[PDB]
């Protein structure tokens, strides 16, 4: 199985994980991108004061979350369990180049 999406900037799409302590961690196409591989952004929120995703502060929620798209957001989004298990949602934003 697998989920492959296509959107455009200014749009917003829901991402999830059937295979559930977790962590969302995507990699985006390197060309015109600072980082060159899989990078974590969210980790499951503990019983305190938690929020903030590092490379994209526009993801709202449980790690079944909505994502507002813009420049460079094209890449695969992985939701990770405690051991090995990962739920990946591929993503393509319209007109992604220089």
């Amino acid at each position: 199985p697998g989920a492959s999406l296509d959107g455009r900037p200014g749009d917003r799409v829901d991402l999830s994980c059937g295979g559930v302590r977790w962590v969302w961690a995507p990699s985006f196409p390197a060309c015109k991108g600072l980082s060159k591989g899989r990078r974590p952004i969210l980790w499951a929120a503990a019983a305190g004061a938690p929020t903030v995703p590092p490379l994209q502060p526009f993801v709202g929620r449980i790690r079944r979350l909505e994502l507002l798209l813009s420049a460079g957001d094209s890449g695969t989004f992985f939701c990770k369990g405690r051991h090995e298990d990962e739920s990946r949602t591929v993503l393509h934003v319209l007109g992604d180049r220089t």
Partner: antibody
């Protein structure tokens, strides 16, 4: 804001045909162009799509390699290049526009009839 | 791919009645299914997109209901103009699949 489909083509078996689809009003750079095959008195079949900026369109694996969608932004038009034609290819080929997954194929072209016969 | 099945391939119905077109999916497609209308030798019209939401300029009699994996289009008021084939389609994973379809005939 229409989609200008090329005139119906009669092609010999095994040969290749490049169909046309021209964008009126809107800029193709502002959507995904999708193509659909419709066998006579049968269901529709999604050929593949393309982000006009990319110019390396994704296709259905059942069609992989056989059909190659390539768009020209400069002429504000897309093209479907189908090769190694069979009687199983005699069908109508729609060119549609899509804003994304969550919006579907909104504007549908009139359709180009491809007749594969010797 | 995510094979799309439409329980019935033909549905006859009299004017001023309500009808339903069912569409079952090979896997949960998280409401990424649209509904299409193809008029006889007429153009193809996108009716409903992303399950429930009506497409611009499409009448209100058209209702897009849908569970996680089981989707059903419903034409509430029957009009003569509604004689056309209806198709469901998934956009969840990249080889987008078009269902078998259901031709809607008029009882008279």
């Amino acid at each position: 804001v229409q989609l200008q489909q090329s005139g119906a083509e009669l092609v010999k078996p095994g040969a290749s045909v490049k169909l046309s689809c021209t964008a009126s009003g809107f800029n193709i750079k502002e959507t995904y162009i999708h193509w659909v095959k419709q066998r006579p008195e049968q269901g529709l079949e999604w050929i593949g799509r393309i982000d006009p900026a990319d110019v390396y369109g994704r296709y259905d694996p059942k069609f992989q390699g056989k059909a190659t969608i390539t768009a020209d932004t400069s002429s504000n038009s897309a093209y479907l290049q189908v090769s190694s034609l069979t009687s199983e290819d005699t069908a109508v080929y729609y060119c549609a526009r899509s804003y994304g997954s969550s919006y579907g194929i909104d504007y549908w072209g009139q359709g180009t009839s491809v007749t594969v016969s010797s | 791919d995510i094979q799309m099945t439409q329980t019935t391939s033909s549905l006859s119905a009299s004017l001023g009645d309500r009808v339903t077109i069912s569409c079952r999916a090979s896997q949960d497609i998280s409401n990424y299914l649209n509904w299409y209308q193809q008029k006889p030798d007429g153009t193809v019209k996108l009716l409903i997109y992303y399950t429930s939401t009506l497409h611009s300029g499409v009448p209100s009699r058209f209702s897009g209901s849908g569970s996680g994996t089981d989707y059903s289009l419903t034409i509430s008021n029957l009009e003569q103009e509604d004689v056309a084939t209806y198709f469901c389609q998934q956009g969840y994973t990249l080889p987008w699949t078009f269902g078998g379809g259901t031709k809607l005939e008029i009882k008279r």
